[PDB]
């Protein structure tokens, strides 16, 4: 919902969905580019914590 | 004889003393900061925490 | 003949004196060259030791080593970095028998005790082929180690000895080795099989070094536990050291629990000295040993607490001082010291007079007066002792100014009666040896003054009659000048208390009735008024603090970015990139010039670079990775491929220093190919700039390096084919794409350390490529990192841990106004450190002095701003202390963590924090991110932490970091392709050349089409096309009324835009090429074939010289108070209306 002052609601579940889909898309691209593995290890760590 | 009244002035004293402790730590770091020779006792202390 | 005999006795001392700087090094070189036997120099401290460690090799040729000391503090909580231990024991292996050689140990090490030699001669083996030893000798040494003779060896603890061939199967390795002794010597190192008995490898020197200095196995563990239960008391704790080692694992400082891992008394390393060894002394021991022992004890009862990790008494882990001075009567000893002992036997003072005042300055007219007046009157030979090779040429033309010829010799004995020679070495100070009249002069013997300059103090020279000569009969209300502040009204004398001292003072009233009470003692600062205006005198306000002057109200958006970024992006996506050509063997011969081997990830990064370079597409590749991972040679292989296709490689870096290293790297790597490589910065002269940039158009320089000077709207590459940009997270957006504005389909390759969020997001969203690198070639260190609260003793022990290692400390404060105070605040906190000051705002000569003196270890701790972020060398610096890590960008946090390290030494990094609830939440997220990731390869994911806490910036604007509620990327791509096919719809000229052919009409006034008037950036773009392509005022007005038709009224930015276009029409009509205007006036620059009425322009000049000056032939500076921009527009309008009325 807009807060009547030009911005939106807080709505933390959309924030968490945005965060998780960011990590997921970033990791998908990272596996697409065939990075060396130690990068995608801690990215999978980050997505799991997300 | 084990419980005492602290009235209006004593609590205002305590709140004022808490504010004084915050501003004296601030002005203490400001005084330990150099360039004292051009300093004044007005920019060194700030009326916001009191 | 030499000068002095030596101590050869059981305990004799040999006193030597008259010793100035760096003479002791060539003296002990003499000692080593004259004594058939070892030389062990005892050092007073690490620093001098390390300093002497490159001194002595300058003067002689023998193999010279330190003993690797444990790097830690006494009773510290840190492992000594096993590799160092591996170096430590190794030297300690050959220390019992080493015939010739020089070992420098410090009193920190020499007071330390070592392993009991049972473990070393039993549980370790280094053996080289040039070791003349027999068969049964090694047989009985294996027997004494406890090994078993099996003639078909398979088991740990076995060896074979048949005929001449000996075999061994150790505790350490799973393989036996064949020895083949001949003529009382070792003659094979044959790695043969456990069963098949044929050789795997022919070795010269076998290195079976134990994994620790101490026994580690089970029997050692129960022996240790027996010792601990005898000494300390065991508590039920899963972190207590007894249970911790009982689990088999190890804590950090475990080695400081030394003697429990042997159950023997520990030797003081004197046991490891050879038979007739010669100890040489430096400074004294009789001082430093005392205060080291005092520090040792003070630290011991400082941590003689804490049943979690209790400590042994220092009597086992060290000698006592008296114990040292007893064992120092067991060896013939030399004491070198810096004064004149009078006379006795076993004593000599050798003429080593310090150098006279030889110094250079720019203040005198001929700078080398002292040297030019010294050298003709110095009867002996003269030696020049330059450190570096290229710095040799820094002396080469310098003494050529005094016309004096250096010859390169190697040996100090090479001196003649009178001759001038250069010596390449590592000295620091010179001297005259008056025995042979020899003179050694260091480079640092030239620049003795690291001096600043004073100022102010004007009225202290005004001792005139107005000072009143301290009359003390002054009246009240007298306006009185007090020279530091100004004039007040004197209001009497007053007594005040001052902290247990009552006093009498002169109360003086300044402005806003602020009192000031100078003492009656210092009455001479006080002067009577001189202006004669005693009843008209002003009043100064005290303090002069006008900071309030930082309030508000600056506007922005003078120039739109979004349309132009969309334009350059559409132009790139419209045209096609260059398909490069690759030669196998020509590229392979370039690969041969690389004197290394590519790590496999580095290779495939290089392969992805070339297999994108050679394509019809345009390269746009991030080559992100951690610093020091080998990024540059990727760009080398890229450029070579580019440059052989004749494509004029352009290199961009954001500082002069990085350009300076890059010039060396490029020139040294391209040392065999017909390519000319140069650089440009502010350090280049204009006369060099004016030929380099001109020649760029001609183009025999193919590789050009520089700062922002390339992006200065004058550099014209004749055929640009490769952009390489380094150290990305700078450069805004405009500087980044300002080069691509020149050539739409240029290939761009961007190196970085940690990419900025915008270029990270745009790369990860498929717009640009990404190629990550990891796995550094040399095994570098993850320099342990901490984030702790500010604590005066924590920073103290950090400083101490670094300085008794011997290196230097970067201590960064990043506020120049108080760094002077913070210097002494640190300095009496650590009184034995040496602190100098360095920041970016000094006078640009003392800074270089500070950094070079730092580079020559003349002081230990440097207080600094973030000037060090420019990435200087000197890896001896090994500890960063960021005092207020609250306000520092996370990318350059990683960068500063990259500053320490660069060594096999374990670097450290303390990140001081304020109190956790005081700081910003974002700062806490930053510090949790930096405390999470301490590895190699973690730079990139740390940039993924930089993103997603600040928001990756807007995809079609500036401001690389920020949430900003941008253009959505799917909508971004749609607008992009719409621009693409609308662009290639009918071959529409790129907007950038509509910039170039346009006359310069800059007026410092906001002239654009605002986003509210036109939301669609394609439409605003094509309107920009139509206005700058419009060539008639009729078409300008038609476009204007069409805009009005489409969107209502015409706002002021649109109106100003359109009339500037009108002005451009008559500017190009007359020949008025360069028009700049401002508030103050501006410059009208005409063409060479201009429509200026010359006589009428002279009439303008002679009717108003204040508003018309020809400064140049066609440069007319007009000075007008153009306060209103409407008046500015009408002024310039009516002015060119006058000029067209006078057009010819
Ligand atoms: N494949 C390799 N094998 C051995 N050493 C390498 C290799 N690649 C790089 N190095 C070493 O690492 C350094 C490379 O650093 P460079 O790419 O010049 O800049 P950065 O320090 O930013 O990586 C060089 O000093 C080089 O000696």
Cα–ligand 1 centroid distance for C659 (angstroms): 17
With a CB cutoff of 8 Å and minimum separation 6, the contacts of C352 are C18, C19, C20, C23, C431, C432, C433
Tokens 């390096």 appear where? C705
What are the two backbone dihedrals, phi and then psi, of residue C1064, each rounded to the nearest 5 degrees?
-65, -35
For residue C1103, what are the contacts with CB-CB under 8 A and spacing of at least 6?
A: none
Is residue C914 a contact partner of residue C841, using CB atoms and an 8 Å limit? Answer: no
Cβ atoms within 10 Å, residue C78: 17
Q: Are C426 and C57 in contact (CB under 8 A)?
A: yes
Measured distance CA(C612)–CA(C336) in Å, rounded = 66
Reduced to 3 states (helix: H, G, I; strand: E, B; else coil), residue C838 is strand
**C-alpha distances in Å from residue C441, one per residue of C152, C371, C383, C510:** 65, 11, 6, 59
Q: Using CB atoms within 10 A of its CB, is residue C773 exposed (0-12), middle (13-18) or buried (19+)?
A: buried
- When CB atoms are compared, the residue of C764, C775, C938 closest to A29 is C764
C94 Cβ partners below 8 Å, 6+ apart?
C126
Residue C278 CA to residue C1079 CA, distance in Å, equals 81
- Terminal-residue alpha carbon distance, chain A: 25
Q: Are C90 and C896 in contact (CB under 8 A)?
A: no
How many CB atoms sit inside 10 A of residue C929's CB? 18
C610 CA distance to ligand 1 centroid (A)? 19
Distance from Cα C630 to the centre of ligand 1, integer Å: 4
In what helix (H) or strand (E) does residue C665 lie, and over which residues does it extend?
helix C656-669
| C632 φ, ψ (degrees, to nearest 5) | -70, -40
Structure tokens at C338: 């810096």
Which candidate from C542, C818, C820 shows the least CB-CB separation from B40? C542
Is B36 near chain C, with CB under 8 Å? Answer: no
Cα separation, C760 vs A22, in Å, equals: 13
Return the SS3 of C587.
Answer: helix
Q: How many Cβ contacts (< 8 angstroms) between chains A and C?
A: 36
Contact C108, C67 (CB under 8 A): no
Other CB atoms within a 10 A radius of the CB of residue C1138 amount to: 13
Contact C385, C349 (CB under 8 A): no
How would DSSP label each residue in C36-104?
Answer: SS-EEEEESSHHHHHHHHHHHHHH--S-EEE-----S-TT-SS---HHHHHHHHHHHHHTTS--S-EEE
Nearest ligand 1 atom to alpha carbon C598? 1
Number of H helices, E strands in chain B: 1, 0
DSSP string, A1-50: ---SSSS----HHHHHHHHHHHHHHHHHHHHHTT--HHHHHHHHHHHHH-
**Crossing angle, helix C632-644 and helix C584-593, to 10 degrees?**
140
Burial class (CB in 10 A: 0-12, 13-18, 19+), C805: buried
Supply the DSSP symbol for C318. B
Residue from C35, C33, C19, C6 nearest C433 by CA: C19
B-C contacts (CB, under 8 Å): 24
By the CB < 8 Å criterion, does B33 face chain C? yes
- Cβ separation A26–C944 shorter than 8 A: yes
| Sheet with C769-770, side-by-side order of all strands | C676-680, C701-706, C649-652, C722-725, C747-750, C620-622, C769-770
- Chain B residues with beta carbon closer than 8 angstroms to that of C821: 32-34
Task: Pinpoint the alpha helices (H) of C670-791.
Answer: 686-698, 734-738, 757-764
Q: How far apart are CA C543 and CA B39, in angstroms?
A: 5
Sheet-wide strand order for C1109-1110: C1072-1077, C1081-1086, C1115-1119, C1109-1110
All partners of chain B with 3 or more CB pairs under 8 angstroms = C
| Exposure string over C116-148, b if 16+ CB within 10 A, otherwise e | bbebbebbbbebeeeeeeebeebbeebeebebe
- Three-class DSSP labels, C167-217: EEECCCCCCCEECCECCCCECCCEEECCCCCCEEEECCEEEECCCCCCCCC
Q: Are C771 and C684 in contact (CB under 8 A)?
A: no
Comparing CA positions, the residue from C607, C623, C895 lying closest to residue C773 is C623
DSSP C767: S
Question: Cβ contact (<8 Å) for C545 and B40?
Answer: yes
Going from the C-alpha of C492 to that of each of C242, C480, C482, C516, the distances in angstroms are 76, 12, 15, 11
Decide the pairing of beta strands C431-433 and C353-354. antiparallel
Helix (H) or strand (E) holding C659: helix C656-669
Report how far Cα C930 is from the mean position of its chain's Cα atoms: 20
Measured distance CA(A22)–CA(A45) in Å, rounded: 14
- Cβ distance C893 to C885 under 8 Å? yes
C820, C888 in Cβ contact below 8 A?
no
Residue with tokens 């409407």: C1126
Q: How far apart are CA C56 and CA C62, in angstroms?
A: 9
For C608, nearest residue in chain A (alpha carbons): A33
Cα atoms found within 13 Å of the Cα of residue C945, Cβ hemisphere only: 25
Phi/psi at C1041 (nearest 5 deg)?
A: -75, -25
SS3 of C299, please?
helix
Length, in residues, of chain B: 50
Q: Does C821 touch chain B (CB under 8 A)?
A: yes
Q: CA–CA separation, C800 vs C370, rounded Å?
A: 41
Are C786 and C927 contacting, i.e. CB atoms less than 8 angstroms apart?
no
By the 8 A CB rule, do B50 and B20 touch?
yes
Buried b (16+ CB within 10 A) or exposed e, C100-111: ebbbbbbbbbbb
- Return the structure tokens found at C259: 């003697």
- Experimental method reported for this structure: cryo-EM
CA–CA dist C577, C154 (Å, integer): 65
SS3 labels along C253-295:
CHHHCCHHHCCCCCCCCHHHCCCCCEEEEECCHHHHHHHHHHH
Q: What are phi and psi of C702, to 5 degrees?
A: -105, -25
Q: For C530, how many CA atoms within 13 A lie in the half-sphere containing its CB? A: 14
- Tokens linked to C984: 């290639």
Break-preceding residues in chain B (C–N over 2.5 Å):
none
B43 to C547: CB separation less than 8 angstroms, yes or no? yes
Residue C492 sits at φ, ψ, to 5 deg, of 110, 180
Distance of CA C268 to the CA centre of its chain: 40
CA end-to-end span of chain C: 95
Q: Is C599's C-beta closer than 6 angstroms to any atom of ligand 1?
A: yes
Helix axes C757-764, C939-946, angle to 10 degrees: 100
Q: Is C678 left (phi over 0), alpha (psi -120 to 50) or beta?
A: beta
Ligand 1 center–CA C778 separation, angstroms: 9
Look up tokens 């006279």; give the residue.
Answer: C356
Instruction: Of C566, C555, C560, C553, give the one whose Cα is nearest residue C1054.
Output: C560
CA closest to B38 among chain C residues: C543
Closest CA to C612 of C722, C489, C475, C494: C722
Measured from the Cβ of residue C165, the count of other Cβ atoms closer than 10 Å reads 17
Extract the tokens encoding C502.
Answer: 């009552």
Which DSSP symbol is given to C561? Answer: -
* Spatial contact of C179 and C166, defined as CB atoms under 8 Å apart: yes
Cβ contact C586:C664 at 8 Å = no
Residue C642 tokens, joined: 């580019």
DSSP C462: -
HSE (side-chain half, CA atoms, 13 Å) at C920: 9
Task: Count CA atoms within 13 Å of residue C176 on its CB side.
Answer: 27
Give the span between the Cα atoms of C529 and C866, in whole angstroms. 47
A26 and C766: CB-CB below 8 Å? no
Q: What are phi and psi of C555, to 5 degrees?
A: -90, -175
Residue ranges in C303-406 assigned as alpha helix (H):
314-317, 321-327, 369-374, 389-396
Name residue, tokens 């906190």.
C829
Measured between alpha carbons, how far is C76 from C804 in angstroms, rounded to an integer?
13
Q: How far apart are CA C600 and CA A11, in angstroms?
A: 46
Give me C690's structure tokens: 């004016």
d(CA C578, CA C646): 12
Residues C100 and C34: beta-carbon distance below 8 Å: no
According to DSSP, residue C424 is labeled B
How far is the first Cα of chain B from the last one, in angstroms, to the nearest whole number?
34
Question: Which residues, other chains included, contact C726 with Cβ-Cβ below 8 Å and sequence gap of 6+?
Answer: C635, C651, C652, C653, C654, C658, C662, C751, C752
Residues of chain C found within 8 Å of residue B33, distances taken between Cβ atoms: 818, 821
Cβ(C661) to ligand 1 under 6 A?
Answer: no
- 8 Å CB contact between C1009 and C1020: yes
Set of chain A residues whose Cβ sits within 8 Å of the Cβ of C611: none
Give CA–CA dist C760/C753, Å, rounded.
12
Distance, in Å, from the CA atom of C178 to the CA atom of C151, rounded to the nearest integer, reads 11
Name the nearest CA neighbour of C1138 among C1108, C1082, C1088, C1100: C1100
Q: Is C722 left (phi over 0), alpha (psi -120 to 50) or beta?
A: beta
d(CA C310, CA C380) in angstroms, rounded, equals 63
By C-alpha distance, which of C460, C456, C500 is closest to C481? C460
Query: Which of C777, C870, C894 has most ligand 1 atoms within 8 Å of CB, for mutation?
Result: C777
Q: Which of C665, C533, C545 is nearest to C594 (CA)?
A: C665
Q: Among C854, C916, C859, C911, which Cα is nearest to C888's?
A: C911
Residue in C340, C350, C341 with CA at minimum distance from that of residue C432: C350
Does any CB of chain B come closer than 8 Å to the CB of residue C547?
yes
Count of residues making up chain C: 1144
Burial of C163 (0-12, 13-18, 19+ CB in 10 A): exposed
CB atoms within 10 A of CB C236: 6
C876-902 exposure pattern, b = at least 16 Cβ within 10 A, e = fewer: bbbbbbbbbbbebebbbbbbbbbbbbb
The answer to whether C573 touches C980, Cβ cutoff 8 Å, is yes
The number of beta carbons lying within 10 Å of the beta carbon of residue A42 is 17
Task: Give residues after which chain A gaps, C-N over 2.5 angstroms.
Answer: none
* Residue located nearest, by CA, to atom 10 of ligand 1: C630
Nearest-Cα distance to chain C for A13, in Å, is 16
Q: Which residue has the tokens 């970067």?
A: C810
> What distance in Å separates residue A11's CA from the closest CA in chain C?
16
Strand pairing class (C526-528; C479-482): antiparallel
Are A36 and C773 a contacting pair at CB < 8 A?
Answer: yes
Within C947-1048, residue ranges assigned H as helices are: 969-983, 991-996, 1017-1028, 1033-1047
Rounded-to-integer distance, Cα A47 and Cα A40, Å? 10
For residue C756, CA distances in Å to A43, B2, C635, C753 come to 18, 64, 20, 9
Chain A: give the shortest CA distance to residue C772, in Å: 6
Question: C628 CA to middle of ligand 1, Å?
Answer: 6
Q: What are phi and psi of C190, to 5 degrees?
A: -110, 110
Is C883:C857 a contact under the CB 8 Å cutoff? no
In C, which residues are within 8 Å of B32 by CB distance?
821, 825
Count CB atoms within 10 A of the CB of residue C291: 11
d(CA C141, CA C152): 19
Q: Smallest Cα–Cα separation from C1096: which of C1135, C1130, C1122?
A: C1135
Helix/strand/coil (H/E/C) assignment for every residue in C609-658: HHHHHCCCCCCEEECCCCCCCCCHHHHHHHHHHHHHCCCCEEEECCCHHH
If you measure from the C-alpha of residue C779 to the centroid of ligand 1, how many angstroms do you get, rounded to a whole number?
12
- Residue A39 near chain C (CB below 8 Å): yes
Mutation for testing the B interface, residue in C821, C824, C863 having most B CBs under 10 Å: C821
Can you say whether residue C1125 is alpha, beta or left, with left for phi > 0 and alpha for psi between -120 and 50 degrees?
alpha
Q: Is the Cβ pair A36, C774 closer than 8 Å?
A: yes
What's the CA gap between C1128 and C1132, in Å, rounded?
A: 6
Model resolution, angstroms: 3.8
Residue C64: name the closest of C92, C96, C39 by CA.
Answer: C39
């Amino acid at each position: 919902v807009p807060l009547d002052g030009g911005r939106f609601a807080t709505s933390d579940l959309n924030d968490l969905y945005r965060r998780v889909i960011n990590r997921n898309n970033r990791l998908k691209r990272l596996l697409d580019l065939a990075a060396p593995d130690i990068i995608v290890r801690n990215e999978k760590r980050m997505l799991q914590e997300a | 004889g084990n419980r005492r009244i602290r009235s209006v002035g004593e609590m205002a004293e305590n709140q004022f003393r808490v504010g004084l402790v915050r501003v004296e730590r601030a002005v203490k770091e400001r005084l330990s900061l150099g360039d004292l020779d051009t300093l004044m006792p007005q920019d060194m202390i700030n009326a916001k925490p009191i | 003949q030499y000068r002095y005999t030596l101590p050869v006795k059981a305990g004799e001392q040999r006193l030597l004196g008259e010793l100035t700087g760096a003479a002791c090094a060539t003296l002990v070189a003499e000692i080593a060259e004259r004594h058939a036997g070892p030389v062990v120099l005892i050092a007073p401290d690490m620093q001098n030791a390390l300093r002497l460690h490159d001194e002595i090799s300058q003067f002689t040729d023998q193999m010279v080593m330190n003993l690797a000391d444990w790097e830690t503090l006494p009773y510290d909580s840190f492992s000594p970095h096993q590799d160092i231990i591996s170096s430590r024991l190794s030297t300690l292996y050959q220390l019992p028998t080493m015939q010739r050689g020089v070992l420098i140990v410090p009193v920190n090490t020499l007071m330390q005790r070592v392993c009991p030699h049972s473990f070393l001669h039993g549980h370790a083996l280094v053996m080289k082929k040039g070791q003349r030893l027999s068969r049964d000798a090694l047989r009985t040494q294996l027997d004494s180690a406890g090994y078993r003779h099996v003639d078909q060896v398979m088991e740990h603890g076995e060896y074979a000895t048949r005929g001449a061939l000996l075999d061994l199967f150790p505790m350490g390795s799973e393989l036996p080795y064949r020895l083949d002794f001949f003529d009382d010597e070792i003659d094979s190192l044959r790695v043969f099989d456990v069963d098949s008995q044929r050789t795997l490898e022919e070795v010269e020197a076998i290195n079976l070094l134990p994994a620790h200095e101490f026994p580690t196995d089970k029997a050692a563990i129960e022996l240790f536990r027996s010792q601990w239960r005898d000494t300390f008391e065991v508590k039920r704790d899963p972190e207590h050291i007894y249970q911790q080692v009982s689990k088999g694992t190890l804590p950090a400082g475990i080695e400081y629990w030394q003697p429990l891992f042997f159950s023997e008394p520990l030797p003081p390393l004197f046991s490891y000295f050879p038979a007739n060894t010669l100890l040489v002394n430096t400074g004294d021991l009789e001082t430093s040993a005392e205060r080291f022992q005092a520090d040792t004890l003070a630290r011991f009862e400082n941590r003689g607490v804490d049943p979690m990790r209790p400590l042994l008494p220092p009597q086992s882990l060290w000698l006592r001082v008296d114990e040292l001075f007893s064992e120092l009567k067991n060896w013939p000893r030399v004491q070198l010291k810096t004064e004149h002992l009078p006379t006795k036997a076993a004593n000599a003072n050798l003429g080593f007079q310090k150098l006279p005042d030889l110094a250079v300055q720019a203040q005198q007219k001929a700078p080398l007066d002292a040297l030019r007046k010294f050298l003709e009157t110095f009867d002996g030979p003269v030696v020049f002792s330059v450190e570096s090779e290229g710095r040799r040429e820094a002396l080469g033309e310098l003494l050529a100014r005094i016309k004096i010829a250096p010859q390169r010799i190697m040996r100090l004995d090479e001196a003649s009666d009178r001759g001038r020679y250069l010596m390449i070495g590592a000295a620091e100070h010179g001297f005259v040896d008056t025995v042979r009249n020899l003179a050694l002069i260091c480079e640092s013997d030239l620049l003795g003054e690291r001096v600043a300059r004073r100022r102010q103090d004007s009225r202290r020279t005004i001792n005139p009659d107005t000072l009143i000569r301290n009359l003390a009969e002054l009246h009240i209300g007298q306006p009185v000048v007090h020279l530091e502040h100004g004039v007040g009204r004197y209001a009497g004398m007053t007594t005040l208390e001052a902290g247990g001292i009552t006093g009498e003072y002169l109360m003086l009233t300044y402005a806003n009735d602020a009192k000031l009470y100078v003492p009656v003692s210092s009455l001479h600062l006080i002067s009577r008024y001189a202006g004669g205006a005693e009843e008209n005198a002003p009043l100064h306000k005290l303090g002069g603090d006008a900071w309030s002057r930082a309030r508000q109200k600056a506007a922005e958006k003078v120039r739109d970015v979004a349309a132009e970024l969309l334009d350059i992006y559409a132009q790139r996506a419209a045209k096609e990139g260059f398909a490069f050509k690759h030669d196998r063997e020509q590229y392979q011969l370039f690969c041969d010039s690389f004197p290394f081997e590519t790590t496999p990830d580095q290779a495939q990064a290089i392969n992805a670079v070339l297999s994108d370079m050679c394509q019809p597409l345009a390269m746009d590749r991030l080559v992100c990775g951690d610093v020091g991972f080998g990024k540059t040679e990727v760009a080398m292989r890229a450029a070579f491929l580019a440059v052989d296709n004749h494509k004029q490689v352009a290199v961009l870096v954001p500082t002069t220093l990085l350009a300076q290293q890059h010039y060396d790297n490029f020139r040294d790597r391209f040392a065999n190919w017909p390519v000319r490589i140069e650089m440009i910065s502010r350090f280049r002269s204009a006369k060099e700039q004016t030929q380099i940039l001109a020649e760029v158009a001609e183009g025999k320089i193919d590789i050009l390096i520089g700062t922002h000077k390339l992006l200065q709207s004058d550099v014209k590459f004749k055929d640009l084919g490769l952009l390489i940009v380094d150290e990305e997270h700078r450069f805004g957006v405009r500087h980044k794409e300002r080069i691509k504005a020149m050539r739409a389909n240029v290939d761009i390759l961007t190196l970085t350390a940690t990419p900025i969020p915008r270029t990270l997001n745009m790369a990860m969203s498929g717009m640009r490529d990404l190629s990550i690198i990891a796995t550094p070639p040399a095994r570098r260190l993850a320099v342990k990192t901490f984030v702790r609260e500010y604590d005066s003793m924590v920073v103290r022990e950090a400083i101490l841990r670094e300085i008794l290692r011997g290196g230097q400390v970067y201590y960064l404060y990043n506020d120049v106004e108080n760094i002077q105070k913070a210097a002494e605040r640190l300095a009496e906190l650590v009184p034995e450190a040496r602190i100098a000051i360095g920041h970016g705002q000094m006078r640009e000569r003392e800074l270089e002095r500070v950094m070079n003196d730092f580079h020559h270890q003349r002081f230990n701790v440097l207080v600094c701003t973030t000037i060090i972020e420019t990435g200087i060398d000197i890896p001896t610096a090994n500890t960063i202390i960021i005092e207020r890590a609250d306000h520092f960008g996370l990318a350059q946090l990683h960068q500063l963590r990259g500053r320490v390290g660069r060594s096999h030494h374990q670097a450290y990094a303390w990140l001081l924090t304020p109190h956790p609830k005081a700081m910003t939440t974002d700062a806490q997220k930053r510090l949790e991110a930096i405390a999470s990731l301490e590895d190699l390869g973690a730079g990139f994911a740390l940039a993924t932490h930089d993103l997603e806490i600040r928001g990756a910036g807007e995809l079609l604007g500036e401001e690389q970091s920020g949430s900003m509620e941008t253009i959505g990327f799917s909508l971004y791509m749609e607008l992009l392709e719409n621009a693409v096919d609308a662009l290639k719809a009918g071959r529409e000229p790129s907007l950038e050349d509509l910039t170039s052919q346009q006359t310069e009409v800059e007026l410092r006034m906001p002239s654009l089409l605002p986003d509210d008037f036109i939301p669609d950036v394609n439409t605003r773009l094509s309107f920009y096309k139509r206005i700058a392509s419009a060539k008639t005022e009729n078409e300008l007005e038609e476009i204007k009324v069409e805009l009005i038709d489409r969107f209502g009224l015409l706002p002021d930015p649109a109106r100003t835009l359109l009339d500037i276009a009108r002005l451009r029409q008559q500017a190009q009509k007359l020949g008025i090429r360069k028009l700049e205007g401002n508030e103050k006036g501006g410059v009208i620059e005409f063409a060479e074939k201009n429509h200026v009425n010359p006589a009428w322009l002279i009439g303008l000049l002679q009717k108003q010289p204040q508003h018309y000056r020809l400064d140049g032939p066609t440069r007319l500076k007009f000075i007008q108070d153009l306060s209103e921009r409407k008046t500015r527009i009408e002024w310039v309008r009516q002015f060119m209306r006058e000029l067209e009325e006078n057009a010819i």
